[PDB]
């Protein structure tokens, strides 16, 4: 009797999760919460077993005792002869993106501009950029760096939320789930694409996946990569093809966390589940694809190839890396 309860963040993930439950013969069922932290709470109470998390949340969950089970592994180059589930994850590139036409905008002139973040507490969208900015400005008043922003999870009436648009009925403004138009990698990038913001803190892959026809969504179908630039830390601006030499940091892959006593089962289930609905899963695209959601990245990132076994039975600190963990610890000393 090993039934796994997943935690969906927001009505859209709940929707996708219920389809997954249905297709899984209920070997996976769904619990739902409004925020990722709520989801972490539910798992602590055991009202839920697991969920996929950005490194920044892995940190919250980890302090609460939850452990990494499997990590997101997207398309790779080296190590590729090895099975995706046995391959070492290579982390992703956190980057700062802006419109090319917004000439003279560099890392060194971000003050009092408009920013777009995936969400408060996330790795590329917040921990890395805010950590860097707090450090470089020698000030903890990061809610006063940019003139306005959309940083889901912040006070809805604060300027950190001024650019957020809420759902299609204008409700839920700045919630840290996908109902907020500018939430996550995609929402933040869109916030920049529509010029609501001057800079978006997302990862390298997001710029590629929503440009040059990679996304047919209405706001993105017509975006061109040439019209965007990455802000390197040395003050220069580079084409989005140079992320390898123009990024804020390399971030650990999003990963699944669960309680310890549920970790083995949750692992067994997911290894089986992705065999069915994973990339070449026996039932995707036929019945259900676990790693697709019309680019909204629900439950898992849309570019995930598989969930990979972790080498060394890593604690959340070993998974995230002492460096990142310290960077977070340091940034959190601010609020």
């Amino acid at each position: 009797y090993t039934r796994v309860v997943w935690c969906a963040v927001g009505p859209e993930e709940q929707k996708k999760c219920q389809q997954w439950s249905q297709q899984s013969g209920q070997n996976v069922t769904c619990a739902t919460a409004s925020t990722t932290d709520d989801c972490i709470v539910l798992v602590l109470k055991g009202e839920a077993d697991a969920l996929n998390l950005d490194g920044g949340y892995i940190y919250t969950a980890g302090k609460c005792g939850l452990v990494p089970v499997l990590a997101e592994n997207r398309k790779s180059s080296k190590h590729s002869s090895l099975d995706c589930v046995l391959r070492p994850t290579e982390g992703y590139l956190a980057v700062a993106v802006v419109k090319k036409a917004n000439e003279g905008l560099t890392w060194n002139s971000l003050k009092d501009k408009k920013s777009c973040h995936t969400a408060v507490d996330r790795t590329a969208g917040w921990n890395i950029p805010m950590g860097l900015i707090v450090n470089q400005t020698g000030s903890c008043a990061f809610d006063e760096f940019f003139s306005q922003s959309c940083a889901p999870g912040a006070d809805p009436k604060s300027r950190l939320c001024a650019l957020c648009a809420g759902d299609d009925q204008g409700l839920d403004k700045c919630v840290p789930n996908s109902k907020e138009k500018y939430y996550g990698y995609t929402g933040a990038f869109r916030c920049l694409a529509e010029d609501v913001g001057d800079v978006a803190f997302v990862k390298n892959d997001t710029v590629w996946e929503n440009t040059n026809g990679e996304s047919t969504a209405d706001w993105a179908k017509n975006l061109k990569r040439e019209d965007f630039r990455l802000l390197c830390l040395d003050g220069t601006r580079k084409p989005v093809t140079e992320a390898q030499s123009c990024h804020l940091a390399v971030a650990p892959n999003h990963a699944v966390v669960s309680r310890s006593d549920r970790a083995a089962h949750v692992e067994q289930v997911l290894l089986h589940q992705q065999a069915l609905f994973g990339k070449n899963g026996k039932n995707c695209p036929d019945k259900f694809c676990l790693f697709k959601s019309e680019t909204k990245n629900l439950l898992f990132n849309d570019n995930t190839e598989c969930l990979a076994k972790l080498g060394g039975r890593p604690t959340y600190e070993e998974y995230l890396g002492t460096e990142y963990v310290t960077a977070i610890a340091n940034l959190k000393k601010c609020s």
Partner: peptide, 6 residues
């Protein structure tokens, strides 16, 4: 440092 936020 340590202590769960919840």
């Amino acid at each position: 440092l340590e202590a769960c936020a919840f």
